[PDB]
């Protein structure tokens, strides 16, 4: 009956400490256990290439969170890098209490993890997005560790040519976590996109890359932007909406542009074949720098019939509009093109990725949807209708209809109720009217006869910020109240962070303080033992993207306008001593560039931090082992264990 749990992340990143959580379940008050935990290679020999970490547990302290280092030297020593097929290492928890008390066959219990080689973060920056051939390129690369603090490790940068050939390689010994370097593009370089990579010398797969386009150009004077009236066209047989565009020309310094806009229309398929209408062209002057144009239904249908086609064929095609305005009397001409005006049959969209799957019976099932306009910002105030059919539990199926208007950012949380002994649930979601966006989802109930279910309820369905406490309501449904505590844990960025023990009451509430080491998302895994079987549930929370751990405000007090040669006072403020990496860039470079090349902002940093995570899906499982596997854990008590990951990426 007594059991010793063991939790650890599914994937080990060599050279970075491993968060191993041990727990003691159903132990008499008079028993105190002590042992050690270490990594181990199963093939070479039982040679522990990790410093053994001791743990002591008792009735009053039945769990302990240990940090287990995995140094590079020991890991290389045991032949982990000499394995032929399969990068797999084992973690073992050895204690003499197992043999003495449980009389087990052996006193070794553990899991089969899957090591990797990624470590730390590297960020690369270049002087400007687009370069002229034969122009110097200045790039700097910052290096940080997994804790997001500056690192002094050694990287090996390398430039690549447009064809893919290496052009320059270097190795650096950073004492300041920044490396700056210059190189010259060959004068005869053909147009293309060059890539700069940077990886840790020890870690083979710890690379990070940036791209810059090489193209022969002269910096423009003004930018031309084409904006559709709506980002979509309704090709529904009932009706076809109006096609109207606004073309705006603006000098780089703000003043409008006087000139003549020449616009041409055509069809464009996803393959990349353009079919222009020999006609329908527009030639209009610009008033206040903006010109309003439109294509009437009659002329559009005439053009379509002249092309030997009907309006039914406009399924994947998009209307392609090209413009080439000529400034007057300067004479300079600039061109713009639009490749995002799709033909659609529904002006809305539905994203049911937030909705859980295979959820517990006897508790409300929350359907979460994000209604978004076709190629646009999330909608608000658009009614959403859900028809949920609870399939045969033994009798005829029963249907329910619930309608709710989206509040803000498109979020809608519709609590469809589900009875006990449910078989399956079928969900038909329709957003907006007329011309609704329809989505479907089917959920299969867990097999009957289980030891119970755990329901995790979130009273607030909005993304918490940083520094705000979060409350979840744990409850046990369809089970016997024989236990006394709920055990829960948090999983952020692929490593166990928190592990606690909450007493059991009616509607137990747990509070988690959203700190700065939980962003941009975390998994809340809770469970309890109903006799000799685990009952578990999980949940994913997306912390809202906001400010940094520190701060940096570059502010220039005064008006935006200036004059060449003026002196500008630039203020920098932080919370500690920091190496501010400054850079001032022209804006006409973006106009010169054919394709958008977004810079390094907080979105990229947040994606970098959470790319190390092992979680997969919005949470929930048919059993305890499935829940832990979805979360990203490695559980093994003696009778149950999770099979090793087959590949780093979830199916």
């Amino acid at each position: 009956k007594p059991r010793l749990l063991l939790f650890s992340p599914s994937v080990v990143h060599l050279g970075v400490p491993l968060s191993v959580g041990v727990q003691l379940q159903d132990v008499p008050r008079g028993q105190v256990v002590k042992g050690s935990v270490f990594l181990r290679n199963p093939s070479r020999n039982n040679v522990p290439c990790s410093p053994k970490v001791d743990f002591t547990l008792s009735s009053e302290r039945d769990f302990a969170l240990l940090s287990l280092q995995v140094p590079l030297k020991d890991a290389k020593s045991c032949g982990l890098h000499q394995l032929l097929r399969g990068p797999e290492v084992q973690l073992v928890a050895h204690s003499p209490w197992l043999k003495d008390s449980l009389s087990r066959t052996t006193n070794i219990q553990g899991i089969n993890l899957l090591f990797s080689s990624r470590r730390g973060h590297l960020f690369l920056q270049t002087d400007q997005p687009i370069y002229n051939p034969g122009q110097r390129v200045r790039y700097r690369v910052f290096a940080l560790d997994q804790k997001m603090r500056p690192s002094t490790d050694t990287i090996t940068v390398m430039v690549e040519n447009s064809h893919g050939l290496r052009v320059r390689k270097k190795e650096v010994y950073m004492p300041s976590s920044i490396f700056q370097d210059d190189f010259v593009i060959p004068d005869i370089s053909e147009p293309g996109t060059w890539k700069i990579s940077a990886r840790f010398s020890d870690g083979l797969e710890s690379n990070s890359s940036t791209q810059f386009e090489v193209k022969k150009y002269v910096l423009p004077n003004f930018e031309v932007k084409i904006t559709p009236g709506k980002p979509y066209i309704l090709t529904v047989p009932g009706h076809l909406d109006e096609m109207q565009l606004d073309i705006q020309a603006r000098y780089i310094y703000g003043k409008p542009v006087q000139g003549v806009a020449y616009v041409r229309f055509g069809l464009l398929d996803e393959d990349g074949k353009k079919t222009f209408f020999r006609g329908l062209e527009s030639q209009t002057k610009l008033v206040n720098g903006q010109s309003h144009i439109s294509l009437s239904k009659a002329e559009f249908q005439d053009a379509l019939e002249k092309l030997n086609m009907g309006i039914t064929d406009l399924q994947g095609l998009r209307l392609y509009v090209a413009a080439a305005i000529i400034e007057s009397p300067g004479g300079e001409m600039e061109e713009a093109e639009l490749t995002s005006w799709y033909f659609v049959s529904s002006p809305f969209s539905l994203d049911l990725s937030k909705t859980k799957r295979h959820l517990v019976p006897g508790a409300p099932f929350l359907l979460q949807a994000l209604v978004r306009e076709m190629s646009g910002s999330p909608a608000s105030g658009i009614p959403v209708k859900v028809s949920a059919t609870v399939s045969s539990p033994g009798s005829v199926p029963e249907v329910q209809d619930i309608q709710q208007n989206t509040d803000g950012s498109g979020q809608v949380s519709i609590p469809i109720i589900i009875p006990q002994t449910i078989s399956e649930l079928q969900l038909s979601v329709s957003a907006g009217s007329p011309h609704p966006a329809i989505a479907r989802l089917t959920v299969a109930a867990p097999p009957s006869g289980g030891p119970g279910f755990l329901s995790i309820e979130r009273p607030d369905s909005r993304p918490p910020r940083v520094g705000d406490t979060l409350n979840l309501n744990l409850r046990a449904v369809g089970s016997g109240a024989t236990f006394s505590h709920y055990y829960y844990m948090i999983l952020s960025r692929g490593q166990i962070v928190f592990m606690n023990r909450e007493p059991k009451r009616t509607l137990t509430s747990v509070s988690v303080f959203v700190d700065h080491h939980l962003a941009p998302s975390f998994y809340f895994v809770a469970f309890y033992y109903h006799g000799d079987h685990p009952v578990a549930n999980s949940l994913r929370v997306d912390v809202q993207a906001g400010a940094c751990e520190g701060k940096l405000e570059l502010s220039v007090d005064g008006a935006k306008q200036y004059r060449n040669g003026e002196s500008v006072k630039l203020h920098l403020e932080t919370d500690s001593l920091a190496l501010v990496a400054l850079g001032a860039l022209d804006t006409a470079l973006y106009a010169a560039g054919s394709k958008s090349h977004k810079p390094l902002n907080m979105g990229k940093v947040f994606e970098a931090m959470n790319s190390y995570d092992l979680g997969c899906g919005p949470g929930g499982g048919d059993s305890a082992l499935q829940v832990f596997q979805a979360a990203g854990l490695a559980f093994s008590d003696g009778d149950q264990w999770t099979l090793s990951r087959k590949r780093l990426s979830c199916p």
Binding site: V218, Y253, E332, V556, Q561, Y562, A584
Partner: protein
């Protein structure tokens, strides 16, 4: 931090990337007059 600069009266000159020697070209500097007063100027290129 966007930081725009302006003159309210300036000369804009845009030369090509390169030109073959002995091949005639045309320079087209443009005067921009964003002031509220109608003006008159004299434009010349310094010999070299």
């Amino acid at each position: 931090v966007q930081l725009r600069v302006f003159r309210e009266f300036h000369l804009h000159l845009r030369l090509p990337m390169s030109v073959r020697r002995f091949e005639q070209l045309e320079l087209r500097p443009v005067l921009y007059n964003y002031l509220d007063k109608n003006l008159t100027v004299s434009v010349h290129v310094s010999p070299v």
